[PDB]
Amino acid sequence: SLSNKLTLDKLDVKGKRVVMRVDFNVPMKNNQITNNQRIKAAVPSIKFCLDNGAKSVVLMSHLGRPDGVPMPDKYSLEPVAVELKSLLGKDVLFLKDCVGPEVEKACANPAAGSVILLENLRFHVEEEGKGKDASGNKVKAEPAKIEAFRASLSKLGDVYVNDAFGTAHRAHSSMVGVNLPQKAGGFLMKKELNYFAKALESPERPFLAILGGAKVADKIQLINNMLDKVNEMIIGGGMAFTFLKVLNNMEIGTSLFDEEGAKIVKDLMSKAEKNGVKITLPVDFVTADKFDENAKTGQATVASGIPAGWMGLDCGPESSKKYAEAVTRAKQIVWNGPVGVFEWEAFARGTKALMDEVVKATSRGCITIIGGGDTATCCAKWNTEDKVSHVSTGGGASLELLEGKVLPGVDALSNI
C-alpha cells in the first residue's frame, strides 16, 4: 500500500543521527550545476531534521551512471555540497566516499546539527548491485560485498529517511538495504505517496487518464491498469494511429504503427467498454513530410487520411477540443505522456493546448497529477510546475506506479 507509511513528519529525530537518501542527480556542465531544482527540493526535509534537533543528517545520493567505478573527476557530488551549503546557509562536510571505516567513524558522533554529504553511491557496484569494471567490462556485485556495503550505510545513522522517490522503483542498497529501526519517507516522498494513493485507491470522479506515447505494445500494463481504475481515457500521440488504423480503417501514411500493439487494440477497447471507460482518440492531426523539426507541415482527419509520405506528429484543433471536453469533465487527472512532438514548435500546439486545459482544470478544483519524464519536462518548459496539483519527481518511478508494479523503495519503508 502507498498509504500507512511512516513519514518524516511523524519521525522523532531529537538527538538522532538521520541517514537520508535524496535526489541529487542534477544536470551539470563543466563540473557545475545547470539546474539545482532537485537540490532545493530536498531542503524542507533537511531543514526539518535540523530544526527538530537532529544530531546529524547524512546525505547519500547518486549522479549520472559511473556504473560501480569511482569517477570523482567526472561524477563527483562535491559541486552539490557547495550549492547545498549556500541554500541551507550552513556548513556541509563532504566525504570522498560513502562507505568504509573512515566514513563510518566520521558519521559516528558528529557535532549537533552536522550536515554530511557522502560521495556518489554508484562509485560502488554494490549500490546498484551491477555495473562495469575499471576496464569497462560488465560485472555483478558480490553478495558478501553487497551485504558489507549495506552494513556500512546502516551504521552512518540511527534513523533512515528516503526522499528519493525517483529511485524507489529499484532495489538498490540505498533504497532497500538500510537496516535501521525506523524507515520513513521524506516530505517529497510523502507528496508522491499522498497524491498517488488517493488517485489510485480513492479518486474523485470522473477520473481521466491522459496517456500519450509512441508505441502501444510497451504500455499494455499501463493502459490495462488505468482501464481498471479510470472513468475516461485520452489515448494521444503516435500510438493513437495504431488504434485508428485498426478501429476506423485510417490511412496513416508514414505515421508510427505498432504491429504487435494492433493485435490487442480491440481487446483494450472491449475492456474499456465493459468497465464503462469513455475513450477519446484524436480526430485530426498536424502532419509532416518527414520526422524532422523543420519538416513541411499539413493537416488531416481520420476521414481524410494522412497521405503517403506524410506522418502525424501532433493532434489538430478538433482533437484539442475533444481533449478539452474530457478534461472539463474530470475531477481528477493523471497525465502520462505528451500528445505530440512537443520539443518541435511545429508539433507542440496540441500538447501546449492540453497543458492549458489541465491548468484551467486545476484552477477550478481538478486534481491534476503529471508523471515524471516528458510530461514533467513539458511543465518545466511552459512554467506550469506550480499550476498543476503535482508533478512527479520520478519518471521511471511514476510509470512503475501507474503500471501497478512494486516499488521496492516504498515497500522497505516502515508502516503506521
Side-chain angles (χ1 to χ4, degrees), residues 30-93:
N30 299 128
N31 305 62
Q32 296 303 131
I33 305 157
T34 57
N35 186 347
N36 67 345
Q37 177 56 53
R38 284 163 153 174
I39 297 165
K40 296 175 62 56
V43 164
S45 291
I46 299 168
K47 254 213 179 80
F48 177 86
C49 290
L50 301 173
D51 293 359
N52 286 250
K55 189 195 290 174
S56 62
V57 179
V58 183
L59 300 170
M60 46 186 185
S61 185
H62 72 279
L63 188 59
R65 286 171 187 170
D67 303 308
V69 177
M71 299 180 70
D73 297 355
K74 178 54 168 293
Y75 295 111
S76 169
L77 277 174
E78 185 148 50
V80 180
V82 173
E83 180 62 57
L84 179 60
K85 187 178 309 199
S86 179
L87 290 161
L88 290 177
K90 200 179 201 295
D91 198 54
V92 174
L93 173 56

Side-chain angles (χ1 to χ4, degrees), residues 284-326:
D284 62 354
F285 312 93
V286 178
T287 55
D289 69 354
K290 49 171 159 177
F291 190 70
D292 191 291
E293 183 177 8
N294 297 115
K296 298 184 60 58
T297 59
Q299 306 93 65
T301 60
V302 176
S304 79
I306 295 166
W310 291 77
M311 47 174 72
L313 293 187
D314 192 16
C315 76
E318 291 304 304
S319 299
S320 291
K321 284 175 184 169
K322 292 288 181 165
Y323 291 172
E325 284 163 14

Side-chain angles (χ1 to χ4, degrees), residues 156-176:
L156 306 186
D158 307 317
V159 293
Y160 168 78
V161 175
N162 192 350
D163 218 12
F165 169 86
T167 315
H169 63 311
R170 283 186 270 185
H172 290 351
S173 291
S174 62
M175 291 290 97
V176 300

Side-chain angles (χ1 to χ4, degrees), residues 91-220:
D91 198 54
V92 174
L93 173 56
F94 177 82
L95 309 187
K96 304 301 179 68
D97 203 348
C98 51
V99 288
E102 300 90 305
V103 172
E104 282 178 54
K105 69 200 288 184
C107 295
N109 181 60
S114 295
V115 181
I116 301 167
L117 175 53
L118 304 182
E119 182 59 291
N120 187 344
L121 290 164
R122 293 180 180 176
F123 282 14
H124 296 266
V125 68
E126 289 75 11
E127 166 60 355
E128 293 174 299
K130 63 160 296 191
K132 311 174 72 67
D133 74 8
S135 297
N137 310 110
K138 292 178 67 181
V139 293
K140 190 196 295 152
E142 299 179 0
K145 294 189 166 184
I146 298 168
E147 214 61 58
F149 178 81
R150 289 177 183 193
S152 178
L153 287 176
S154 305
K155 286 296 211 306
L156 306 186
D158 307 317
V159 293
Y160 168 78
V161 175
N162 192 350
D163 218 12
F165 169 86
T167 315
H169 63 311
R170 283 186 270 185
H172 290 351
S173 291
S174 62
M175 291 290 97
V176 300
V178 178
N179 174 23
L180 281 174
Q182 297 209 112
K183 293 171 287 182
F187 288 110
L188 293 177
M189 182 70 76
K190 176 80 144 56
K191 271 182 285 172
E192 304 289 352
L193 297 180
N194 284 343
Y195 273 104
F196 279 111
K198 197 286 191 294
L200 299 161
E201 303 304 344
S202 181
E204 301 309 312
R205 295 175 181 104
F207 170 24
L208 165 67
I210 310 182
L211 301 186
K215 311 153 201 281
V216 178
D218 59 352
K219 292 170 190 282
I220 290 167

